[PDB]
Enzyme design. Structure first.
Site, PDB file in Angstrom:
ATOM      1  N   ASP A   1       0.828  -1.200   0.000  1.00  0.00           N
ATOM      2  CA  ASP A   1       0.000   0.000   0.000  1.00  0.00           C
ATOM      3  C   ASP A   1       0.873   1.266   0.000  1.00  0.00           C
ATOM      4  O   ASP A   1       0.466   2.306   0.488  1.00  0.00           O
ATOM      5  CB  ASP A   1      -0.956  -0.029   1.209  1.00  0.00           C
TER       6      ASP A   1
ATOM      7  N   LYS B   1       3.164   3.506  -5.631  1.00  0.00           N
ATOM      8  CA  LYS B   1       2.613   2.598  -6.638  1.00  0.00           C
ATOM      9  C   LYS B   1       3.664   2.052  -7.593  1.00  0.00           C
ATOM     10  O   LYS B   1       3.609   0.880  -7.983  1.00  0.00           O
ATOM     11  CB  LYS B   1       1.498   3.296  -7.425  1.00  0.00           C
TER      12      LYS B   1
ATOM     13  N   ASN C   1      -4.985  -0.519  -4.437  1.00  0.00           N
ATOM     14  CA  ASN C   1      -4.854   0.577  -5.408  1.00  0.00           C
ATOM     15  C   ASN C   1      -4.188   0.179  -6.708  1.00  0.00           C
ATOM     16  O   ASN C   1      -3.541   1.012  -7.346  1.00  0.00           O
ATOM     17  CB  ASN C   1      -4.066   1.747  -4.813  1.00  0.00           C
TER      18      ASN C   1
END
Ligand SMILES: Cc1nc(C)c(-c2cc([C@H](C)c3ccccc3)n[nH]2)s1
Ligand SMILES: [K+]
Ligand SMILES: [K+]
Length: 214
Positions: A139, A142, A168
């Site tokens: 998390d 990215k 995500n």
């Protein structure tokens, strides 16, 4: 005064100490009714709960703590003798997360590591007595999902059965990471679809007037 501190303050004023459920609900309420923030939230939280309940990991690694929501979420389900290790790049957030865990009464199950994932991960065996991880929750930044995944492999921290759970991956998106683990026969991949809600945030229009070809 920061947004992250305001999240913590809201918890301290509204949740019941020692009650992780209570903490989770306060953070979810604040970040969707009071002031928007990065937050896994309850919808995705339930997917996490089911994954942990299914695989019952004992040693868990989390990349990116932020304010402690995920840590409270996972650690409240971990059994006696379990350890959650959480890496957090930002000292302020690391401190917020520590307070979040203290308040939830979950601090004995968690060890916060303050530093960058790629500097800490190679230290896990020597400095934190880790053989292999049961579960990794991604998390953080990215663009570091793929290289950290490969770094975990190279360091010998993954065994057959190790669960990678990545948040995500659609928004903002991690297409290189998804293509790798789906392409590679070394990973068996399941994608759980959910939602991300935005509320009262700064947005904008762009006007662009074409000037002709060039
Ligand atoms: C190389 C890195 N190692 C770590 C541990 C990072 C990290 C990122 C975050 C927070 C959650 C975050 C997540 C997404 C976007 C911005 C900030 N905490 N810690 S980065
Ligand atoms: K695959
Ligand atoms: K749907």
């Amino acid at each position: 005064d920061t947004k992250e501190q305001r999240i913590l303050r809201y918890v301290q004023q509204n949740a019941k100490p020692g009650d992780p459920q209570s903490v989770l609900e306060a953070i979810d309420t604040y970040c969707t009714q009071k002031e928007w923030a990065m937050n896994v939230g309850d919808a995705k939280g339930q997917i996490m709960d089911a994954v942990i309940r299914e695989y019952s990991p004992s040693l868990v690694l989390e990349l990116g703590a932020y304010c402690g929501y995920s840590a409270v979420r996972m650690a409240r389900l971990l059994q006696p003798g379990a350890r959650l290790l959480t890496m957090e790049i930002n000292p302020d957030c690391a401190a917020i997360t520590q307070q979040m865990l203290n308040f939830a009464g979950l601090q004995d199950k968690v060890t916060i590591l303050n530093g960058a994932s790629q500097d800490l991960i190679p230290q896990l065996k020597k400095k934190y007595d880790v053989d292999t991880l049961d579960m990794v929750f991604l998390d953080h930044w990215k663009d570091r999902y793929l290289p950290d995944t490969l770094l975990l492999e190279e360091c010998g921290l993954l065994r057959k059965g190790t669960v990678l759970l990545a948040d995500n991956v659609i928004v903002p998106g991690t297409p290189d990471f998804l293509a790798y683990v789906r392409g590679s026969s070394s990973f068996e991949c399941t994608h759980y679809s959910s939602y991300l809600e935005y509320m009262k945030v700064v947005d904008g229009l762009e006007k662009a007037i074409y000037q002709g070809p060039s």
